[PDB]
């Protein structure tokens, strides 16, 4: 166990040996072992998607703030990419549907039967790419080309992936809510908070605290 999310609370016993476990399950969603395996895989997939997304938002945004490049912001990047895209919208959607149907069915079949996508005849000769590591959510093969899962620091990298994943998930939801509440970019929100942190936060964006629900906002003001 990495620790306790609530020090002094009684952590559930089924979360003792999981990587990135702080005993956090107050709703008891992972009490069933099959549910726990499915949610471990789901948390890993969500974590890696949010990881890549937050990288592709923040690193261009930080480079733009430093003045290195001039890329469109994340909430409008779909518009400028589609105008210069050789492939139009509908066929892009269809291709994404086809490719993700294929790869997610392969991932799902490996989840149901571990190592099944690496057996003879599972692919058309290329099943050695996906032999599996025998672990839920850690495929390996082509997905680990540098082979650092065989290194001594494999367990530390599992903990690093999960915690950075939770941070990335919270960061992307923060990006979406900050755009929906303030209308500006994430680095703009950070600079506005750094300029005046008392007055520039969620309590003054006019959205997160609705005026009808909080009548004291318009009363206790200068």
């Amino acid at each position: 166990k990495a620790g306790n999310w609530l020090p002094g609370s009684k952590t559930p016993a089924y979360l003792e040996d999981l990587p990135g476990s702080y005993g956090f399950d107050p709703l008891k969603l992972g009490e069933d072992p099959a549910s726990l395996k499915w949610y471990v895989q789901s948390e890993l997939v969500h974590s890696r998607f949010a990881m890549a997304a937050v990288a592709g938002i923040l690193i261009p945004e930080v480079l733009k703030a430093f003045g290195a490049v001039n890329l469109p912001v994340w909430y409008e990047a779909g518009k400028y990419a589609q105008e210069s895209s050789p492939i139009p919208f509908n066929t892009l959607i269809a291709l994404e549907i086809f490719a993700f149907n294929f790869v997610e069915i392969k991932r799902w079949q490996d989840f149901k039967k571990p190592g099944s996508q690496g057996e003879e005849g599972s692919f058309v000769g290329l099943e050695g790419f996906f032999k599996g590591t025998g672990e839920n959510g850690y495929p390996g093969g082509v997905f680990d080309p540098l082979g650092l899962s065989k290194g001594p620091g494999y367990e530390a990298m599992k903990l690093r992936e999960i915690k950075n994943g939770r941070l990335a998930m919270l960061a992307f939801i923060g990006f979406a809510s900050q755009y929906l509440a303030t209308g500006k970019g994430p680095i703009e929100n950070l600079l506005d908070h750094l300029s005046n942190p008392l007055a520039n936060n969620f309590t003054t964006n006019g959205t997160s605290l609705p005026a009808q629900a909080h009548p004291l906002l318009s009363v206790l003001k200068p």
Binding site: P26, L27, K28, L29, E31, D32, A34, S35
Partner: protein, 163 residues
């Protein structure tokens, strides 16, 4: 369905005008600043805000000047009426599954006690509050119990009458 938006319906505007006129006719018998005058003014303000909000919500009005709800999930999604029936459907189904799962969990927990009937009329309030808070994650546990086969009692274990 041949309806018109309430923001451009003449019957909707006529109904707002008539309701405001009736409230203002009631308003003129009281002096300014009195409690009936303030109450009637608050009612007038609420009427104006309600008609403005119903016009701004994209509600469709009939020939009677009254809003009509669209409940087919197709017509609601492609014409912006999902807040009339579809989103309330999702919200109600979530809360109803919450209540049902909390009740089922309390009944199952009380089944294992020495006096199972005692907890049904003398409520274990801390246990009921703990189970009630855990009902937020009801769809995950319920769908897992459905897949596992533990949600349903077997037909051999349920009493039936002779046929």
């Amino acid at each position: 369905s041949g309806l018109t938006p309430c923001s451009e319906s003449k019957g909707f505007a006529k109904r707002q005008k008539n309701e405001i006129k009736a409230l203002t006719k009631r308003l003129k018998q009281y002096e300014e600043g009195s409690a009936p005058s303030l109450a009637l003014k608050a009612t007038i303000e609420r009427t104006e805000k309600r008609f403005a909000n119903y016009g701004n919500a994209g509600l469709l009005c009939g020939t009677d000047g009254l809003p009509h709800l669209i409940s087919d999930p197709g017509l609601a999604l492609r014409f912006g009426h999902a807040g009339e029936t579809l989103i309330p459907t999702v919200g109600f189904l979530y809360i109803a599954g919450w209540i049902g799962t909390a009740g089922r969990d309390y009944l199952i927990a009380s089944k294992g006690e020495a006096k199972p009937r005692e907890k049904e009329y003398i409520i274990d309030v801390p246990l009921a509050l703990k189970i009630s808070a855990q009902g937020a994650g009801w769809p995950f546990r319920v769908i897992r119990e459905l897949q596992k086969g533990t949600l349903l009692e077997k037909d051999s274990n349920i009493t039936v009458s002779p046929r």
